[PDB]
Structures are given as C-alpha cells and as structure tokens.
Amino acid sequence: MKVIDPQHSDKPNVLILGSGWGAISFLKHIDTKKYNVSIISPRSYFLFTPLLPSAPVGTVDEKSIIEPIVNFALKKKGNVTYYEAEATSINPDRNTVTIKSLSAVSQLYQPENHLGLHQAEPAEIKYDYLISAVGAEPNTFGIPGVTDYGHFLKEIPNSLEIRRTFAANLEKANLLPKGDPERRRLLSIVVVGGGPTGVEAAGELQDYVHQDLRKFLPALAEEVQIHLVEALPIVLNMFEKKLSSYAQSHLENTSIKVHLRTAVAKVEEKQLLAKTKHEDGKITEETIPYGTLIWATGNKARPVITDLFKKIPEQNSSKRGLAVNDFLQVKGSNNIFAIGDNAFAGLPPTAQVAHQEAEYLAKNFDKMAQIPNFQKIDLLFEENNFKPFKYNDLGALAYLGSERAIATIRSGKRTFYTGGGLMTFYLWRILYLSMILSARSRLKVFFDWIKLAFFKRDFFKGL
Template sequence: MFSRSTRQWASGSMLRSPVRAAFRRAASTTTPVPVPPTPPPIPSSTTPVVKKKRIGFFRLTWRLTWLSLLGSAAYLTYEVYKEVNPSPQIPQSPLKPNGNRRKTVVILGSGWGAVSTLKHLDTSLYNVVVVSPRNYFLFTPLLPSVPTGTIDLKSIIDPVRTIAKSTPGEVKYLEAEATDIDIAKKQLTIQHSSYSATSGVHHVTIGGDEAKPIVATIDYDYLVFAIGAQTATFGIPGIEKYAYYLKETADAARIRRSLFETIEASQLLPKDSEERKRLLSVVVCGGGPTGVELAAEIKDYIDEDLSRFVPGIETEMSVTLVEALPNVLNAFNHKLIEYTESIFEKQQLDLRVNTMVKKVDDKNVYATVKKSGGDTENVTIPYGTLVWATGNGPRPLTKAVAAQIEEQKTARRGLLIGEHLLVDGTDSVFALGDCTFTKNPPTAQVAHQEGIYLASHLAKLSKVDDLKYLIAQNTDPEQLVRLQRRLDRAQASIQPFKYTHQGALAYIGSERAVADLVWGDWSNVSTGGSLTFLFWRSAYVSMMLGVRTKILVVSDWIKVKVFGRDCSKE
C-alpha cells in the first residue's frame, strides 16, 4: 500500500545517509592523533650488552713501539743500501758541459777539515784529488776508548775511497805525503808513504841498484791545506823519547801494549816491591777532553774488567792525571769541573792540577807543583806507562809553506788565514783545521764547520767562474746584462766564515759524562751524570760519517756490556 521510497523514509535510512557521509568527509580531513613511540625493551640479565672497544694505554704503547722499530729498521736498511750501492759518478774531464775549463782542487789531508770538505763538496764542478798518507778518516773523539778495548779500532775508521765514492763526481785518491808546495807555480810535490803500527813511517821504493822513493808532482788551481798538527812537547826533555801520544791509530795500539807489558812484568815481582808499584802506575799528562777521557777509560778498565782476570790489581794499579792549569776541562762550566773532580775522587783517580812537567826519564816524571800561597814544590811521579795528551804544534810542511809567504812571517803556531779561509798572501790556497792559527779553538768541531763552509764557498767560486766565462763568450747586449746581474748576485752571496759553538762533551768514567751545550744565542745547558752519558754516546754516534761505523760502534758497546773487555795485549 506504501511505495518503496515511503518505506525507506519511514525506516529512517534516508535520514541517516547524509549524516554518515558527513562523518566520512570529516574523518578524511581531520589530522591524525600521533601515536607515542614504543619504548625499547628493558634488557634482561640474560641479554648481552655490546660495548665499544677501547685500546688500552699499554697496548697502544706497545703498538707504537713496534711501529717505531719497524720504521727505524726500514730507514737503516735504506741507508745501508745507499752506502753500499752509491750512485754512478760523473767522470773527470778537462772541460765542463758549458765549455769552460774544469779546475783542479787538491785536498791535502784526511782529517776532520779535509773529509768535511770532500763530503759536502759538489765534486762534479771540479777535478778533485785527495792526497794523504792515511787512506782513512779517523773519528778522533772516540779514540780514547780504543786502548782499553771499549771500541775496536776498525769501528771508528771510514776509508777515504768510500767517502769519495758517495760524492756526485769522480774523485782520485793518492796515498802519499806532501813534501813540498810551490805557491808561485801552484804545484805540489808528493812522495808515496805508508804507516806501520810496529815500525812507524816507512817509504815504499822502486826496485833497482839504487832504490828511490816514488815521487810525483801535481798541478792545482785550488789547494785545500788540511794536514792538521803534531803533538807539541814544548821542549820538555824526555817527552818525545819516553811518552806515548794519542793522535793516530798506532798510538792507541802502543798504549794498550804498554799497559799489558807492565802488568805482566809486575806479576814477577813481590807485592811490596817499589818497582812493582811503579810498573802498575799509569800517568796521563793533559787535562783536556782527550786526557780526561783516556784516564777515565783506563780506570774503568782496571776496576770493571782487569780485576776479574787479575784479582787484587784494582788496589795496586793507579791512574794519575796531571794538568798544569788549576782545573781540568778548562773550557767547561765551573760546576761541571767540580762535578768531574768529585767523580774522580770517588773513583780514586789521582788528579794533580797546578802541576807542570819539567822533565821525564825512563821511570819518573819530574814536575813542579804551584801551591795556593804562590810557593812551588818539586815532585817526582813514578810511572810504568806515560801518555802525553796535551798541546798542538805545526807540522814541518806548515812551516815550509809559511816560510814562502811574506804575510806569514809572523806565523808561529799555524797559518794565518782570512775570513774566507784563504791563506794570507795567496790567492789559491785555503787552510783549515789545526794547521791554522785563529781565534777559534783547535777542535774537531771547528774543522768540521770550516769544511762545510769551504765546500759551499768552492761551489760559489765555480758559479762565478762559469758566469765570467759566459760573459766573455757572449756578444748579445741583452744577454750580457742578464749575465752581469747573475754574476753580481753570485758574488754577493759569498759570505765570510762564521763559527757557531755548539758545546763540548767529555766522558769522566763510571758511565758518567759532562756536557756544556749551546742552543743558539739564547740558551746554555750544563749537565752531567748517567743520562748525560747516554746523550754523549748518542751524540757521537750521530756525528759519525758512515752507517757502517755507527752500527759497529753500537755493536761494540753492546758486546762490552754483555761480555766485558778482554785482557789480551793486542
């Protein structure tokens, strides 16, 4: 009876449809309510906690140590390879690549000054000839350690040819002794000679009815005069005949032989014998670093090693250090001098200062002691072994050179040189080291710095000479202007030599050393003791020229630490 639409309206479906649609539209446009994040689960006692790994201090130190050792080993391997396999050298020739004449530089000597010049010189710029009767460089600061066996003699020797082979240009070496120099002709006369540890200097001769030494002459453009000095005896009677020196390798061998000859001879005499006491007395004259270090080394040897082989000898054998000045190590800080004297007192090393040697015979040293009041007293010091380690004097060749030059007439203790190390009165002879007389001390440190300077100076002279040659060969005005400017700059770069004192080191026994160091112009460091002893060793190793000698010296120290020094005569 009702229609379909009427029934839907009556049931309310038609009324509800618009409302539902409105709610749907509202729901679709309404911003959703944010849902809070789910909290992380609380770890139970059975759930493992992952922690960030940390490297411990000791583990980090261990790793850094290993890395340092590996790096040092790699660097050492590289240095050894480089020393054993040097680069090819440029051969000597009469002309340079630019057509200019290649000049000849003759280096006379194989000590600190000569070898420093050779090592730092660009040998491709010159025809370089080295002349020396000694075909090796001797590291003299460690020579006092040789007579006692602390260091083997071969460990402090670098062959001249090995040093020359490491330079960029070919170097000729002649084992010979210079007998005469003609300054006017720029000519050097040489004679072959060699050293023998047992018989001294002898000459190799040519066979025949009348054997004659091998003599030759060399022309030079520049002469590097670096023959060093000889030990000065100051005219004291008996020194030259009875005392041993400490300047060459043969000297160290003689001192060691004398020590053991007197020790073995003393064993045949009664213990209360005066002759036995004399034989077991070692006297070292000279309170500089060489004398102090030798006396300290011998005292260590007696107390630490000989006492094991000859029981009781440490109480019988004595070491006396004699110095004419009021102090030993006179160039050091006064506190270090006092420290050295206190160490000597603990070691029972007999130190005698203000004691001037007047005469020596085959058994005694006769000296005069200056007392505090000004009075003097004559003393007699018996000895079995006497070492003279003080004073330098000019060699005969140095005197012969000075006699040829008017400007050298007043030279008594060595050649007089200018600010560029050029010998006064010459234009082609450079002198350096102990053969000269300057305001600088006659030490290895001075000669080393002079050699470095001279190598640089010779390189600058070569550049100036090349520019002058190019100017003489050139005709282009613009080129000439540029070359002249370069020449002016090259000449202006030539500066005088200036010595920079870096300090001094000395070993004083019982694994102690003193160091008086200078750091530039603003700081001085004076120290002594066991840590200074380690610095003394490391400083000397770093100063050595070759990797081979550095390794050998360190090996010798390790060997002595483990096995001790031996008691053989040789």
C-alpha cells in the same frame, strides 16, 4: 822532477791535503760535478778522534772508529783521486805540492789514465785550488824525554802502542811480589794533560782496571794507580766551573790522583819531574814514578806548514798555523785555503770548528762555480757578496769514566742541555753516535757498546 797534471777536463783541479775532519767534511759536500778532486794523505782512512781514548783499553775497537777514504769518494759521483802519501812541500809559485812515501794511487769513477808512478817515488801534484787540512802534531814543549819514553794519543798506532806498554807492565809486575816498589811502579800510569783527551783517557783506562782486570787479577788491580797532571788550576776549562769541579770530584772518586797546577819539567825512563804551584805561590818539586806515560797536551804546526810560512811574505811571522781570511783563504795566496788545526782563525782547535769551516768552504766553492771570473781572488769574494765564516759554538762533551759524563749544548746565545752524570753519559753516547760520519762506523760502535754491556772489553797485546 816528475809533475802530475791532469786537465783535459774543463773543471778546476781542487786538491785536498789530509783525510781528517776538515779534509773529509769538505769532501762530503764539495761538488764533484763542477770540480775534479784529488786527495793526498798518508792515512787511507778517516779517524773519529773523539772516541780515540776508548781504543787502547778496548771499549771500542780501533776498526770501529775509522772509515776508508775511498768509501766517502764512492758516494761522490765525479772524479776522485787518492794519493796515499805525505805532502812534504807546498809550492805556491808553481801551484804544486811535492809528495813523498807514495804507497798507492786510487782513481775512482775514472776509467782513464795511468800516471806512471812508482812506490816511494817523489812527485809534484799540480792544483788549481788547494785546501790544506793536514791537522796539527803533538807538542812536547821541548820537555826532554817525552817522545823517548812517552806515548801520544793522536792516531790509531798510538792506541796499540799504549795497550802493548800497559799489557807488558801488567805481565812483568804480576811476577814480582806485592811488596816490591817496582811492582807498584810498573802498575803506575801518568796521563799528562787535563784536557778532555786526557780526562777521557785516564777515565777509560780506569774503567778497564776496575771492571775487567779486577775480575781476574784483583791483587794487581788494587795496586794500579792512575795519575792525571794538569798545569792549570782546573780540569776541562772549556766547561763551566760547576762542571769542572764535578768532573774533578768524580775522577777522584774513581781513585784517580789529580795533580792540579802541576807542570812536568822533565821525563826520565822510570819517573818524571813535576813542579807544582800552590795557593800561596810556592813552587814544590815532586817525583812521580810511572810505568806507562800518555802525553795528551796541546798541539803544534807541522813542518810542511812551517816550511810554507817562509815562502809567503805575509805568513813569515805566523806560528800556530796559517793566517787566514774571513773566507778561510791563506793570506798572501790567491788560490790556497786552510781549514781545521793547521789554519789560524783565532778559533779553538776542535773537530767542531774543522767541521763547520769545511762546510762553509764547500758551499762557497759551488757558489764560485756559477761565476765567470773564477773559470785577484781576495777581492772577488767581497765583490760578489757572500758571507764571511762565522763560527757557531755548539758546546762541549766529555766522558769522565764509571759511566758518567758532562755536557753543554748551545747555539749562539741560548744554552739548553743536561750536564749531570748518568743521564748525560747516555746523551754523550747518543750524541757521539749521531755525529759519526758513516753508517758503518756508527753500527760498529753500536755493537761494541752492546758487547761491552755483556762481556766488557778485549785487551789483546798483539791485536
């Protein structure tokens, strides 16, 4: 029951799922004069995921790297509606999306209707076009215990969750005497995943331990040991070999114990079972005790997308995400598009890919606006002659700790960059600032780095 369906306007109802890179990048460029836009997301803010590994340790504040959805929609002149809720079912036959956990509805540039909704009431939202940018969710690979005893580094609440844990262990351990093995354990951190998230997380945590904790509890700081665990034989594989080594070396120089070729078989409350494959093909078992565990491995399709696989014939055998056209249309659907991590275009799950995908689609959308037939769709795209989506790989950036980073900057075939150390760390800084989506988020981080230069980090367990 309960169906929301506004259509007094002679504009198509475009409906966006998500408030991330895809969803927001799309919103930034969509023509609200030609279309009526509605957004559904449980998160009322955009999250600049690349600096999320700085939040917990407090290099940057959780508020500095987020921006309200409504601040974006305010720059769009036309009608924007934001439902603060989560999409539970996509219904292609009815062209609605069932939502759940409705917190709020904001109607911007709309001095008009009242939907008659109540909080936490279920409702179907009709759409003429659907853009699905709900992102992926963290994958535990069915490795038992991960969720029970570990923390993802994925959203903002995760950042607080980590600080509270580490804070609590610092407090508990410092009461125990130096000898106690429990004290050594509680001061142990284990970051699973040698992908940039994990590398940056391990590095940031270290910077704090070296630069801040040491300033007033050096007896503790010395006993803290940070482990990084990677199943592959190399860290940051998306970079050149030359840089993946320098990263690994530098991490080790900052006192991080890098466990290469090591796969976590199980996670217990106070330790995790690791298997390691060696050069000679032998498998050895290790036990790594831990106080804090950060799980920064790969991601996985959300149940809403899994749900949808079964409802469309030619998605039945999809797994990673929605199989999608060269025009980023969900195969088997006449009016649904998918961008970013919930889509499958055999491209890397990266904000870079989501950003481009979004822009391409938005431009296609105002192109559709000037064609009678859109006012069955599969064919019109090729018929009316506009390009398929071609991804342009711009490169990669990763902070390694101790004011060092690696970089590669390309466009197409040419590669032009500096990927060393201290120089690259500044580049990394600048480049990140620049590719932030808002002046506010930009100014906040600029100030956060200046205060860092003079006073180095806030670590409040209740804030």
